[PDB]
């Protein structure tokens, strides 16, 4: 039966000692540990994955003023737990159906507890899958009304990760702050960037040989908050626009895939503008 | 068997791979290697062929294969594929793609004659010494930009060189001296996603947290740095490279990255198509 | 209305002007072509894709001479005609589910004419996607008949592929000369090979840091028939031999799926005990 | 700042970390990196700590890391991340490997000292003496194969190396010369996926129609070949690579692979592991 434990703090001494002092005074079997120090932000990360040989609720109760002398931010859960997740989407159903079917095959290990949408397109889709869909359109007069009910729907559902799986609605900066760093967004990258309508046409144009993607944080920031993770795959002049459009959408799903892995298995910590992922 | 390789870009239309291997048969060759691509975007096709005599008066092939380019409006060429093509390098105070270019050249990947080294400053002469490879220091200063061109221009032209490779070579060629050397200088550059301007682009890499360090070689053109692309690679990194730890990381892509491109050009893989390249494997 | 090619043939003087004279006689655009000479095995192979500006039943039918002249196995398939595959299963989903997925999402564009195994276990999901499903079971005393129902089946669904997704049974010589080259084969592979019991056991002992698989052709030959796909997963230490199983699965999936779509492209070759497979 | 690296293996039980930790803390080191790894089918725990002093009695250090060590049955060490390991090479008439980390450590890629160049034959004493590296040849013939060894193994020893690399050492060590450098030699070779045995792999390879070539670096054993896995490296080929294709592709692939493990163990991220190995990246 695990537990992991994850943490960040200001990097200072003693920081170590204090945590595994605390899994040996509670008689726990360190699983896996991972330690990462920034000396730029000068920031400490831990992920410790333990089990005890009643044990860690103490442990938990005595982590409290080892966390506010170091002023960590921390959370220990049950690995056995599934993290509650809903997923937005709208009319590109590939995203989506790649998650179904990680889901599915027991690879991603969460609970979906809805998937909600701007569009009535992929209900069989959920339909397929024993899973609550509900459709909340958009109109011009509505884009404010819209956003309360999903984010009321989140809210309610106890879920405490949204997925954009290709949900193509600009979230307003209210709604980005209220999931800041609680949602993952995914979209298509280039080398050089392309920016303006028909990008896979630009990509084309320009010869590229490589399309790539990038999943990252929503924040109410300026700029796209921060890079969860970035995959290319390599392309040639034979590809066609429709072409590297199917690769950038293959791209897409392997990219969000492995962030949402990657948060349902707290290996992501925030780290500033930037993140630390542990394999 | 004694090869050569034709290499042909036309307009598309119907007929060429035909007439091409058609004259080919005439002469007794066999054909070792054949790819071909039409771009009904550009509307340019492409063909590129290995072949060697089987019992060949290649200067009576050439006068052969006239009518045929003609017809076709064809520009094109066939190679000796034993001779090594002559190149001459330009680079400045970064030792490393130069030096990664020696290393390839001198235990045999890159088959060519590298006819001399150029730079704005001397440090690279003893690199150069060490290898037997004649180099020249022409060094600029605010007003001489254009006569330091016409300098290495100069050499570029009693060398006989048919390729510039610009090994980091950090001063921007000026329309004249990029015009001159069209479809024939390769450059070098670092590249991110998503793109840095400016200053240490290596410390925004950084601040941004990028998963990705990449580079580009690309045809020299006037548009700095933007010329059509031949090759591009990226290699993982992660949060725990330092701005510095990412900048060696990104040498060594542009490493990769030119050496991959230089021996695309002098295996006459690489065609030009407008904006863009067609790069056969 | 596109048209596929692929022809292979001793290598012999005017194979390519009279393959692009016929093409250019019946006013076909080429839109791929892809052409490979083998000096060792002295076989020449060609994959065209093209399209006519009645044409084509007259290039099909004048192809005939020059086939015979040059000695060349050849086809010429339309390119919107869904290749008919029969998929066998055992108790292992990993295979079949990513095929369905795949087939399901459109990347694989094939029809399914039925799901055939030795045990009752993927009935369910094989109702779920609309396809037939055949249980034959296995006893000591009726291997050879067994095998006679699932062939039968083969014979009268017109199938042109049989995909052997970890279907655990081994094949009788006879069935496997009577699948010759029309069946693929997926197994794990290592560097180094292990062989017999537990095999990611045996590769977690000795520390490898990759794990791989391989997909095949069946032949009656003794060792495996001709290589069609090989892929390889970096691991580490940290890898529990559950956990290397896992990665093999995963390549197994993609190595089974990158060789069935090579086949039902018509880009692979026979190449004496050897493939050629064009990009 | 001036870093140090603690690396340790012991049976695993309770408390290490904290012991280890605990001594740091108390001699103000800031610990910049802690990998940790705990094997429990081997019922080995691992340790590498990377630090520096922040106000450093390193040897006062030492001293009082032993009751920690006896306690809990560890082997380690506490080495000074700017010193230079001290390695041998051994080459036969293959130069692909000595010359790619040659020109790595010219580079600055790997930071060793090479105390030495050895060879059963004369072939690579220009590219020793190139760059200014002692170079011994040491001839072998039928009846000299444990006077030959002993030669050699006494200049490992007299130059004080901690690590000999096998860059395509073409002699088989004896059990002898393998125990004396246990834990301390890297050897490479080529690996195929199937495995292919005996004369021409390569033919072999190319027969079989692979679609992959790769190599494997092993401390060395008794055991010819075999022996704890560092690293492996694949890269991918296909039906138009000749043997002869194939086989510069796995030298290249050597290359990469022996010098991924020659970085490892300079950077005190490979240990022993019974049959395997560990290595943090």
Request: hydrophobic fraction near 40%; avoid cysteine.
């Given at each position: 039966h695990q537990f992991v434990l994850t943490l960040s703090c200001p990097?200072?001494?003693?920081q170590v000692a204090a945590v595994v002092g605390l899994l040996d005074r509670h008689r726990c079997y360190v699983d896996e540990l991972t330690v990462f120090d920034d000396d730029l932000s000068a920031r400490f990360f831990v992920r410790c994955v333990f089990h005890a040989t009643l044990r860690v609720d103490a442990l938990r109760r005595e982590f409290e003023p080892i966390a506010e002398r170091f002023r960590m931010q921390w959370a220990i859960h049950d690995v056995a737990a599934r993290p509650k997740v809903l997923i937005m989407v709208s009319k590109l159903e590939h995203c989506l159906a790649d998650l179904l079917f990680r889901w599915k095959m027991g690879e991603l290990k969460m609970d979906i507890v809805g998937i909600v949408s701007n569009?009535?397109?992929?209900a069989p889709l959920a339909a397929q899958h024993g899973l609550p869909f509900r459709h909340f359109p958009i109109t011009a007069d509505t884009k404010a009304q819209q956003e309360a009910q999903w984010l009321d729907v989140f809210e309610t559902s106890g879920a405490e990760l949204v997925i954009?799986?290709?949900?193509?609605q600009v979230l307003s900066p209210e709604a980005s702050a209220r999931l800041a760093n609680r949602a993952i967004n995914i979209h298509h990258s280039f080398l050089p960037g392309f920016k303006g309508a028909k990008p896979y046409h630009q990509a084309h144009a320009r010869g590229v040989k490589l399309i790539g993607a990038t999943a990252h944080f929503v924040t109410?920031?300026?700029?796209?908050?921060?890079?969860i993770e970035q995959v290319v795959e390599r392309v040639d002049h034979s590809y066609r626009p429709e072409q590297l459009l199917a690769v950038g959408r293959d791209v897409e799903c392997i990219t969000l895939a492995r962030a949402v892995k990657a948060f349902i298995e707290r290996r992501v910590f925030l780290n500033g503008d930037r993140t630390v992922v542990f394999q």
């Open positions: 990097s200072a001494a003693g569009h009535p397109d992929f954009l799986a290709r949900y193509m109410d920031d300026l700029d796209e908050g921060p890079i």
